[PDB]
Short mmCIF file of C-alpha atoms and ligand atoms in Angstrom, two decimals:
data_model
loop_
_atom_site.label_atom_id
_atom_site.label_comp_id
_atom_site.label_asym_id
_atom_site.label_seq_id
_atom_site.Cartn_x
_atom_site.Cartn_y
_atom_site.Cartn_z
CA UNK A 18 -0.13 -0.25 -0.39
CA UNK A 19 1.34 3.27 -0.66
CA UNK A 20 0.93 6.24 0.58
CA UNK A 21 -1.01 4.57 3.39
CA UNK A 22 -0.99 4.50 7.20
CA UNK A 23 -0.64 1.99 9.91
CA UNK A 24 -3.95 0.48 10.44
CA UNK A 25 -3.56 -0.70 14.23
CA UNK A 26 -3.23 -4.61 15.15
CA UNK A 27 -6.50 -6.43 14.30
CA UNK A 28 -8.44 -3.35 13.13
CA UNK A 29 -9.06 -5.05 10.38
CA UNK A 30 -10.15 -8.81 11.55
CA UNK A 31 -11.34 -10.07 8.21
CA UNK A 32 -7.46 -9.38 7.14
CA UNK A 33 -5.47 -12.73 6.13
CA UNK A 34 -1.93 -12.76 4.57
CA UNK A 35 -1.22 -16.16 2.55
CA UNK A 36 2.20 -17.69 3.29
CA UNK A 37 4.58 -20.02 1.42
CA UNK A 38 7.22 -19.59 3.45
CA UNK A 39 7.16 -15.63 3.24
CA UNK A 40 4.16 -13.26 3.00
CA UNK A 41 2.68 -13.32 -0.90
CA UNK A 42 -0.66 -12.18 -1.05
CA UNK A 43 -3.26 -10.99 0.82
CA UNK A 44 -6.89 -12.20 1.39
CA UNK A 45 -10.54 -11.86 3.04
CA UNK A 46 -11.97 -14.19 5.51
CA UNK A 47 -15.90 -14.60 4.52
CA UNK A 48 -16.53 -17.65 6.99
CA UNK A 49 -14.58 -19.71 9.55
CA UNK A 50 -13.38 -21.83 6.84
CA UNK A 51 -13.23 -19.58 3.64
CA UNK A 52 -11.31 -16.84 2.28
CA UNK A 53 -11.71 -14.91 -1.14
CA UNK A 54 -8.57 -14.04 -2.55
CA UNK A 55 -7.50 -13.24 -6.24
CA UNK A 56 -6.77 -15.98 -8.79
CA UNK A 57 -3.33 -15.22 -9.54
CA UNK A 58 -1.99 -15.51 -6.38
CA UNK A 59 -3.21 -19.33 -6.43
CA UNK A 60 -0.08 -21.80 -5.87
CA UNK A 61 0.37 -24.93 -3.97
CA UNK A 62 1.96 -24.84 -0.50
CA UNK A 63 -0.23 -22.16 1.08
CA UNK A 64 -0.81 -21.25 4.50
CA UNK A 65 -3.14 -18.78 5.63
CA UNK A 66 -2.44 -16.76 8.76
CA UNK A 67 -5.09 -14.96 10.88
CA UNK A 68 -5.19 -12.37 13.01
CA UNK A 69 -2.00 -11.10 12.15
CA UNK A 70 -0.11 -7.62 12.21
CA UNK A 71 3.30 -7.57 11.91
CA UNK A 72 3.97 -10.69 9.68
CA UNK A 73 7.24 -11.25 11.49
CA UNK A 74 7.17 -11.95 14.61
CA UNK A 75 4.48 -13.94 16.48
CA UNK A 76 2.79 -11.57 19.26
CA UNK A 77 -0.35 -12.96 20.16
CA UNK A 78 -3.74 -13.80 18.00
CA UNK A 79 -2.40 -15.04 15.22
CA UNK A 80 -4.08 -19.00 13.81
CA UNK A 81 -1.60 -20.56 10.91
CA UNK A 82 -3.87 -22.74 8.90
CA UNK A 83 -3.56 -24.69 5.62
CA UNK A 84 -5.68 -24.83 2.65
CA UNK A 85 -7.83 -27.82 2.03
CA UNK A 86 -8.09 -26.84 -1.64
CA UNK A 87 -8.15 -23.72 -3.90
CA UNK A 88 -10.78 -23.24 -5.72
CA UNK A 89 -10.05 -20.38 -8.86
CA UNK A 90 -12.93 -19.25 -11.23
CA UNK A 91 -13.44 -21.72 -13.79
CA UNK A 92 -13.50 -18.27 -16.02
CA UNK A 93 -10.42 -16.87 -14.92
CA UNK A 94 -8.05 -15.42 -17.82
CA UNK A 95 -4.39 -14.83 -17.00
CA UNK A 96 -4.22 -12.48 -20.34
CA UNK A 97 -6.27 -10.32 -19.08
CA UNK A 98 -6.69 -10.78 -14.99
CA UNK A 99 -10.45 -11.11 -15.88
CA UNK A 100 -12.36 -13.33 -13.02
CA UNK A 101 -8.98 -12.95 -11.20
CA UNK A 102 -11.20 -14.68 -8.08
CA UNK A 103 -10.21 -17.48 -6.15
CA UNK A 104 -11.83 -19.71 -2.80
CA UNK A 105 -9.70 -20.92 -0.31
CA UNK A 106 -11.16 -23.49 2.48
CA UNK A 107 -9.32 -23.72 5.29
CA UNK A 108 -8.39 -27.24 6.68
CA UNK A 109 -10.33 -26.40 9.96
CA UNK A 110 -12.59 -23.30 10.74
CA UNK A 111 -10.73 -20.38 12.54
CA UNK A 112 -12.24 -19.36 16.02
CA UNK A 113 -13.49 -16.27 15.54
CA UNK A 114 -13.51 -13.61 17.37
CA UNK A 115 -12.75 -9.65 17.47
CA UNK A 116 -9.39 -9.92 16.14
CA UNK A 117 -10.80 -12.57 13.78
CA UNK A 118 -14.08 -11.72 12.20
CA UNK A 119 -15.38 -12.69 8.79
CA UNK A 120 -16.35 -9.73 6.65
CA UNK A 121 -19.94 -9.49 4.65
CA UNK A 122 -20.33 -10.18 1.02
CA UNK A 123 -22.55 -7.24 -0.93
CA UNK A 124 -26.27 -7.16 -2.06
CA UNK A 125 -25.76 -4.43 -4.34
CA UNK A 126 -22.88 -2.87 -6.67
CA UNK A 127 -21.16 0.30 -5.15
CA UNK A 128 -21.21 3.72 -7.17
CA UNK A 129 -18.55 5.42 -8.12
CA UNK A 130 -17.80 7.78 -4.83
CA UNK A 131 -17.95 5.37 -2.33
CA UNK A 132 -15.16 5.55 -0.01
CA UNK A 133 -13.75 1.96 0.60
CA UNK A 134 -10.70 0.58 2.71
CA UNK A 135 -7.90 -1.29 0.86
CA UNK A 136 -5.26 -3.01 3.58
CA UNK A 137 -2.40 -5.11 2.81
CA UNK A 138 1.34 -5.56 3.30
CA UNK A 139 2.08 -4.60 -0.04
CA UNK A 140 5.07 -2.47 -1.57
CA UNK A 141 5.15 0.43 0.15
CA UNK A 142 6.82 2.37 -2.66
CA UNK A 143 5.99 2.72 -5.87
CA UNK A 144 9.76 2.98 -7.08
CA UNK A 145 11.32 -0.18 -5.85
CA UNK A 146 10.15 -2.14 -2.71
CA UNK A 147 9.77 -2.00 0.87
CA UNK A 148 8.00 -4.08 2.40
CA UNK A 149 6.06 -3.36 5.73
CA UNK A 150 6.09 -5.72 8.81
CA UNK A 151 2.42 -4.30 9.76
CA UNK A 152 -0.45 -4.12 8.20
CA UNK A 153 -1.53 -0.76 6.08
CA UNK A 154 -4.60 0.79 5.08
CA UNK A 155 -5.81 3.08 2.72
CA UNK A 156 -9.18 4.90 2.60
CA UNK A 157 -10.14 5.19 -1.55
CA UNK A 158 -12.95 6.51 -3.17
CA UNK A 159 -14.59 3.86 -6.31
CA UNK A 160 -14.30 6.13 -9.52
CA UNK A 161 -16.83 5.98 -12.43
CA UNK A 162 -16.67 3.78 -15.05
CA UNK A 163 -15.54 6.35 -17.75
CA UNK A 164 -12.88 7.71 -15.67
CA UNK A 165 -11.45 3.77 -15.12
CA UNK A 166 -11.85 3.42 -19.08
CA UNK A 167 -10.27 6.33 -20.28
CA UNK A 168 -7.04 5.28 -18.15
CA UNK A 169 -7.50 1.61 -19.42
CA UNK A 170 -8.77 1.74 -22.52
CA UNK A 171 -9.56 -1.80 -23.52
CA UNK A 172 -8.45 -2.78 -20.63
CA UNK A 173 -11.71 -3.11 -18.19
CA UNK A 174 -14.42 -5.74 -18.11
CA UNK A 175 -18.23 -5.69 -16.79
CA UNK A 176 -16.09 -7.55 -13.56
CA UNK A 177 -13.42 -5.13 -12.54
CA UNK A 178 -13.96 -1.40 -11.20
CA UNK A 179 -11.19 1.33 -10.27
CA UNK A 180 -10.29 2.75 -7.51
CA UNK A 181 -8.14 5.17 -5.87
CA UNK A 182 -6.12 8.96 -7.16
CA UNK A 183 -5.76 9.63 -10.62
CA UNK A 184 -3.18 12.33 -8.57
CA UNK A 185 -0.94 9.44 -7.78
CA UNK A 186 0.87 8.89 -4.26
CA UNK A 187 -2.06 6.25 -2.80
CA UNK A 188 -2.73 2.99 -4.07
CA UNK A 189 -2.49 -0.67 -3.68
CA UNK A 190 0.59 -2.27 -5.03
CA UNK A 191 2.34 -5.93 -5.60
CA UNK A 192 1.73 -8.19 -2.34
CA UNK A 193 -1.07 -5.90 -1.32
CA UNK A 194 -3.03 -8.83 -4.86
CA UNK A 195 -5.66 -10.46 -2.81
CA UNK A 196 -6.82 -8.39 -0.16
CA UNK A 197 -10.01 -6.24 0.62
CA UNK A 198 -11.79 -3.30 -0.53
CA UNK A 199 -14.54 -3.09 1.82
CA UNK A 200 -17.01 -0.26 1.43
CA UNK A 201 -20.08 0.24 4.04
CA UNK A 202 -18.78 -2.70 5.52
CA UNK A 203 -19.41 -4.95 1.98
CA UNK A 204 -16.58 -6.58 0.73
CA UNK A 205 -16.66 -4.89 -3.22
CA UNK A 206 -13.47 -5.49 -4.15
CA UNK A 207 -10.27 -7.83 -4.54
CA UNK A 208 -6.90 -5.96 -5.30
CA UNK A 209 -6.32 -6.95 -8.45
CA UNK A 210 -3.72 -5.19 -10.56
CA UNK A 211 -2.68 -1.90 -12.09
CA UNK A 212 0.10 -0.13 -14.17
CA UNK A 213 3.30 0.25 -11.52
CA UNK A 214 2.01 1.65 -8.04
CA UNK A 215 0.36 5.36 -7.87
CA UNK A 216 1.60 6.47 -11.26
CA UNK A 217 -0.24 9.64 -12.24
CA UNK A 218 -4.29 8.79 -13.96
CA UNK A 219 -3.21 4.96 -13.46
CA UNK A 220 -5.83 3.92 -10.55
CA UNK A 221 -5.55 0.23 -8.57
CA UNK A 222 -8.42 -2.21 -10.47
CA UNK A 223 -10.38 -4.68 -8.38
CA UNK A 224 -12.40 -7.61 -8.89
CA UNK A 225 -16.17 -6.21 -8.92
CA UNK A 226 -17.29 -9.09 -6.45
CA UNK A 227 -20.88 -8.06 -6.15
CA UNK A 228 -21.04 -9.81 -9.62
CA UNK A 229 -19.92 -12.99 -7.92
CA UNK A 230 -22.04 -13.29 -5.21
CA UNK A 231 -24.19 -16.13 -6.53
CA UNK A 232 -20.96 -17.91 -7.63
CA UNK A 233 -19.36 -17.32 -3.99
CA UNK A 234 -22.71 -18.72 -2.96
CA UNK A 235 -22.96 -21.85 -4.91
CA UNK A 236 -19.74 -22.93 -4.90
CA UNK A 237 -19.01 -22.90 -1.41
CA UNK A 238 -23.06 -24.70 -1.34
CA UNK A 239 -21.74 -27.47 -3.00
CA UNK A 240 -17.88 -28.35 -1.37
C1 LIG B 22 1.47 -13.25 -11.60
O1 LIG B 22 2.00 -12.45 -10.37
C2 LIG B 22 1.89 -12.32 -9.24
C3 LIG B 22 1.35 -13.72 -8.72
C4 LIG B 22 1.72 -14.03 -7.35
C5 LIG B 22 2.04 -12.50 -6.14
C6 LIG B 22 1.93 -11.67 -7.04
C7 LIG B 22 2.10 -10.98 -8.17
C8 LIG B 22 2.34 -9.96 -8.67
C9 LIG B 22 3.15 -10.11 -9.12
C10 LIG B 22 3.73 -8.56 -9.68
C11 LIG B 22 4.91 -8.22 -10.47
C12 LIG B 22 6.14 -9.07 -10.32
C13 LIG B 22 7.50 -8.81 -9.72
O2 LIG B 22 7.65 -7.89 -10.20
O3 LIG B 22 8.17 -9.74 -9.17
C14 LIG B 22 4.55 -7.24 -12.02
O4 LIG B 22 4.41 -9.07 -12.91
O5 LIG B 22 4.38 -6.65 -12.43
C15 LIG B 22 2.75 -7.68 -9.26
C16 LIG B 22 1.57 -7.37 -9.03
C17 LIG B 22 0.18 -6.58 -8.55
N1 LIG B 22 0.73 -4.94 -8.99
C18 LIG B 22 -0.24 -4.66 -8.21
C19 LIG B 22 -0.12 -3.20 -8.88
C20 LIG B 22 -1.87 -2.86 -8.46
C21 LIG B 22 -1.82 -1.49 -7.82
N2 LIG B 22 -3.06 -0.79 -7.57
N3 LIG B 22 -1.54 -0.42 -8.93
C22 LIG B 22 -2.56 -3.71 -7.45
C23 LIG B 22 -2.29 -4.53 -7.01
C24 LIG B 22 -1.34 -5.36 -8.10
N4 LIG B 22 -0.30 -6.69 -7.85
C25 LIG B 22 1.26 -8.69 -8.59
O6 LIG B 22 -0.08 -9.11 -8.33
CA1 LIG B 23 3.32 -11.65 13.94
#
């Protein structure tokens, strides 16, 4: 997250770190046994780390659980990143509490202008890598479709939306992929891609979760 601030330990109880010997992507806890993340963060040997804050020190409240299965959306296209969503079922349920809680799925899509909270342990620099130890937060609005399409002509599908700042300096970045974009207490987006990080006129692009609600529910139901 570039241009963000320290969230404060466990202030974002639904955030998870996907670890394969190191933190590589974020994710959102949606029920005690399932997490939603991005399809391009898929790999085997994933351990889900809940209740985290400083990812390099155990401080307490952390729960490490291996993933049972990862279900990448069947229509996920790696070249366009269309349908960049994945469900990971945990080997055992997490114990929910105030530091580990699920987030709600939406009932409507959100409008441009809605303000959301984006978090992650991704790069904090737009030029070079600087990965933090604690969770970073950023408040960003959803942009209109015309501003999104002007920024990325021919690269935005109806399963994506843009959020951020056209002037640059504040944005999500690599390492943040798979994590949450929460607006009015609902999971509306998944950190997916962007051109560089926090570059002028190149906002973050997010998976439009409201379009996968029925799929999430059905897929969780049948598994
Ligand atoms: C397939 O790529 C990945 C697989 C697993 C984990 C991260 C990535 C991933 C990789 C890479 C690097 C790879 C490198 O240089 O090492 C690449 O290909 O540009 C970038 C991202 C990434 N960039 C991002 C930029 C933004 C943004 N708001 N501007 C948001 C999410 C991003 N995720 C990103 O999500
Ligand atoms: Ca820790």
